[PDB]
């Protein structure tokens, strides 16, 4: 089986710059049957390049393919706003066709600190026997952020789930949502609920908290 490895995982660049994506094959890709696809959130993949270098009609010429054997490269001569998406490489030189793990091209922007908010569980939810505490990290860059839950200043672990939004089309920032889930009993066992946020744009960890019932 031919295994394709794309590099890098994430490519952070500004609009107008030259983007170069790499695809490395475990063995030689016979007959240069190498293809490049672009995928945006909520849509199906779109064929950018086939035959390592050939470009279908309708695809902008700023997309170009090159390479052979085991080394292949997708080049975007100038990064336009709609080019910031996910890119996959695919070999179809064997009967068994395989994809690369993909490369995300994101907009590189100025570092922005997250706006941190904390939300206690509503009375309506508490009436159902469960408690969800929500920590919001609003509009930040880069994407890498760390959220830590403190209950009575005790570090929580494995009782929270988070999700991150797609990079915003206007300010190129990210937003993170972390939900701490407890039973009503376990929630009423403690008093202080806090969310601590660590980010590159923060000189020191920001902590937003509340006291249960106040």
């Amino acid at each position: 089986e031919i295994v394709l490895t794309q590099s890098p995982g994430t490519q952070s660049l500004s609009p107008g710059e030259r983007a170069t994506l790499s695809c490395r094959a475990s063995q030689s890709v016979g007959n240069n049957k190498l293809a490049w696809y672009q995928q945006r959130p909520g849509q199906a993949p779109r064929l950018l390049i086939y035959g390592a270098s050939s470009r279908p009609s309708g695809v902008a010429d700023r997309f170009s393919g090159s390479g052979s054997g085991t080394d292949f490269t997708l080049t975007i001569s100038r990064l336009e706003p709609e080019d910031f998406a996910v890119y996959y490489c695919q070999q179809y030189g064997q009967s068994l066709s395989t994809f690369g793990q993909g490369t995300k091209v994101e907009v590189k922007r100025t570092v922005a600190a997250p706006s941190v908010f904390i939300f206690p569980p509503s009375d309506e939810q508490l009436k159902s026997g469960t408690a969800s505490v929500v920590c919001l990290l609003n509009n930040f860059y880069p994407r890498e952020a760390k959220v830590q839950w403190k209950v009575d200043n005790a570090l929580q672990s494995g009782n929270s789930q988070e999700s991150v939004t797609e990079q915003d089309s206007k300010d190129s920032t990210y937003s993170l949502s972390s939900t701490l889930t407890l039973s009503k009993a376990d929630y009423e066992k403690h008093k202080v609920y806090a969310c601590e946020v660590t980010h590159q744009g923060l000189s020191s960890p920001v902590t937003k908290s509340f006291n249960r019932g106040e």
Partner: protein, 230 residues
């Protein structure tokens, strides 16, 4: 132009079997390769198999070999993906893709690469039952920066399956709205959060209502979010 139209979303229990269809319209059907590619939530593309209809030759990926059956019906110009012994990890979006050509009909010249794609078909495998969400208010803090910015929202909790759509003030409020990707809880139910940042000055006057829509359960919930009277 070749167009591929797949069947609707499917909700299945572990151990069952599902069949996704891919109806082709325009171009020629018989001479071009039809493949199936699945994509798990937040994951990459994965080639499952392909078939050239006129040759009745199907090629499967070793990972699915034995559990998968890909067919091509030339009488209806329709390809089929059948997946048996479904497990929760089979939950994904299944795309049907056809290779492109240079010309038309049977003496069209194939390029191999998947130039045409279907709209995709969401297949969810779980023990959970279809459930409408409970929508709780993420009320604005009573310590919101006076004359600054405050965040509020709604927690769309415990529903099945995906997807859910959330709007604000029936689409009138779009600026500053963040509807987060849903997470799959350990209970087998989904949950997401939808927030929005507004001026603090508006908190006592403006009405904020999140409109949560869950088509798979025929559920429609409009929840009003207001400051807690503490």
């Amino acid at each position: 132009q070749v167009q591929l139209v797949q069947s609707g979303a499917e909700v299945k229990r572990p151990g069952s079997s599902v069949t996704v269809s891919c109806k082709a319209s325009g171009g020629s059907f018989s001479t071009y390769a039809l493949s199936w590619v699945r994509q798990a939530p937040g994951r990459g593309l994965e080639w499952m198999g392909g078939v050239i209809p006129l040759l009745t030759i199907t090629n499967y990926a070793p990972r699915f070999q034995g559990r998968i059956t890909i067919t091509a019906d030339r009488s209806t110009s329709t390809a089929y993906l059948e997946l048996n012994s479904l497990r929760p990890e089979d939950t994904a979006v299944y795309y049907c893709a056809r290779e492109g050509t240079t010309g038309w009909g049977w003496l069209g010249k194939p390029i191999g690469a998947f130039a045409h794609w279907g709209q995709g078909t969401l297949v969810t495998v779980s023990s959970a039952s279809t459930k409408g969400p409970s929508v709780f208010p993420l009320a604005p803090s009573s310590k919101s920066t006076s004359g600054g910015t405050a965040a509020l929202g709604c927690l769309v909790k415990d529903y099945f399956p995906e997807p859910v759509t959330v709007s604000w003030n029936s689409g009138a409020l779009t600026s500053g709205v963040h509807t987060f990707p849903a997470v799959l809880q350990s209970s087998g139910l989904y949950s997401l959060s939808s927030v929005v940042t507004v001026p603090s000055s508006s908190l006592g006057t403006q009405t904020y209502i999140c409109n949560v829509n869950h088509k798979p359960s025929n559920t429609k919930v409009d929840k009003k979010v207001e400051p807690k009277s503490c």
